[PDB]
């Protein structure tokens, strides 16, 4: 029979999902994650793709890339890409205003336009799915941001094309993310939806009106770079101060010690998205000392009060843009990891004077579970088509 798959293909992560039996599966990894970095690795042997690519980035930080969505659709030109390439350790070349990653790959020097970055991404959420369905699947529903223009939108069908999938549609990350929670089935009138997506590295909050299951972007806010990175490193420069603190010794030019804290902040955050302690345990950090210390949400909270602040004022600007009342909000969705945060979750639901919030799906993979559901209505509709 014809299957279908849904992928969210993000910045720094991508999921799949398929509808299957009535309900949504989301597919692990073989390594058994439910999202895979959206990282590409070129070694001296080996093309690394996901987890894989991600664990070997301080090892191989040139070759090893990562934000071609950044980079994706867009001219060399642009501004955004113009200050973007100042903080990447990959080289970014241009080519007929085209921009294009050049890497070291076998010991040669090769270059890779975005798409093509992506498509290697999504051969590896095409592979993934067909890991678990024991079948291949080329139909696929794309997702993307909903301020992506055009050309951004024809460049990620490009690299789905490369990947081997069949776009059945490319369809905006917010309107995946209220299909997820099936908030376009509601019946006749106007919905007002308020999504509120925290990633990694980008932040988006998207309002939208469905009328009569129809979905139109009203507003559209956010910070490009901010997210759940931001909050790690706020975790960093504390304990680098308490380091000093502790033991008289500065590990900031340590590039390795600095690197394998920053990973043990990013797993003690998570921690603290449901418990109120978060212990570090980092043998041998510097100078063959050992960091075991700890952290609570209190002290995180504050390490970062004024960015989870910050979130708000997106949302105020969406709010003026749509022309809407807080009160004239229907739902309030969330996406990303980032809202697993419970300081954050209580930000936005005391701007909503109290007002739940959608939070039963998992923030990583509502988008991923609203791209299957629709990804299998169109085969289905393309399917009753023929026959
Ligand atoms: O690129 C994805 C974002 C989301 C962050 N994840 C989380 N942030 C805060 N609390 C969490 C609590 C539980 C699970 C989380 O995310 C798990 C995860 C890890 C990696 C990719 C997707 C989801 C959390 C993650 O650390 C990163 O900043
Ligand atoms: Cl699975």
Redesign the pocket.
């Known amino acids: 029979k014809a299957a279908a798959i849904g992928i969210d293909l993000?910045?720094?992560?991508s999921?799949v999902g398929v509808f299957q039996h009535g309900k949504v599966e989301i597919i692990a990894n073989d390594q058994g994650?439910?999202?895979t970095?959206s990282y590409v690795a070129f070694t001296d042997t080996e093309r690394l793709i996901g987890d894989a690519a991600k664990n070997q980035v301080a090892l191989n930080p040139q070759n090893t890339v990562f934000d071609a969505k950044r980079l994706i659709g867009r001219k060399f030109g642009d501004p955004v890409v113009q200050s973007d390439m100042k903080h990447w350790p990959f080289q970014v070349i241009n080519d007929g205003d085209k921009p294009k990653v050049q890497v070291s790959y076998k010991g040669e020097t090769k270059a890779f336009y975005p798409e093509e970055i992506s498509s290697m991404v999504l051969t590896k959420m095409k592979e993934i799915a067909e890991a678990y369905l024991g079948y291949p699947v080329t139909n696929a529903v794309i997702t993307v941001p909903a301020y992506f223009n055009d050309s951004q939108r024809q460049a990620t069908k490009d690299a789905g094309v490369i990947a081997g999938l069949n776009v059945l549609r490319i369809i905006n990350e917010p309107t995946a993310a209220a299909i997820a929670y099936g908030l376009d089935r509601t019946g006749k009138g106007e919905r007002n939806v308020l999504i509120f997506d925290?990633?990694?590295?980008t932040f988006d909050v998207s309002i939208l009106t469905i009328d009569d299951g129809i979905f139109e972007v009203k507003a559209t806010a956010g910070d490009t770079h901010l997210?759940?990175?931001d909050?790690?490193n706020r975790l960093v420069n504390h304990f680098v101060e308490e380091f000093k603190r502790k033991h008289k010794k500065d590990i900031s030019q340590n590039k390795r010690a600095v690197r394998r804290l920053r990973t043990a902040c990013?797993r003690a955050?998570?921690?603290?998205?449901?418990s109120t302690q978060a212990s570090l345990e980092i043998d041998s950090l510097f100078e063959g000392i050992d960091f075991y210390t700890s952290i609570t949400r209190a002290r995180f909270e504050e390490l970062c009060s004024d960015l989870f602040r910050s979130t708000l004022e997106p949302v105020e600007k969406a709010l003026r843009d749509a022309k809407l009342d807080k009160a004239q909000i229907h739902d309030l969705v969330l996406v990303?990891?980032?809202?697993?945060?419970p300081k954050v979750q209580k930000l936005l639901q005391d701007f909503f004077n109290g007002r739940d919030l959608n939070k039963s799906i998992?923030p990583?993979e509502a988008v991923a579970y609203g791209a299957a559901v629709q990804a299998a209505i169109l085969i289905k509709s393309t399917r009753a088509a023929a026959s």
């Open positions: 993000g910045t720094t992560y999921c994650n439910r999202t970095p925290l990633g990694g590295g997210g759940g990175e909050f790690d990013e955050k998570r921690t603290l998205s449901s990303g990891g980032s809202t697993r945060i998992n990583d």
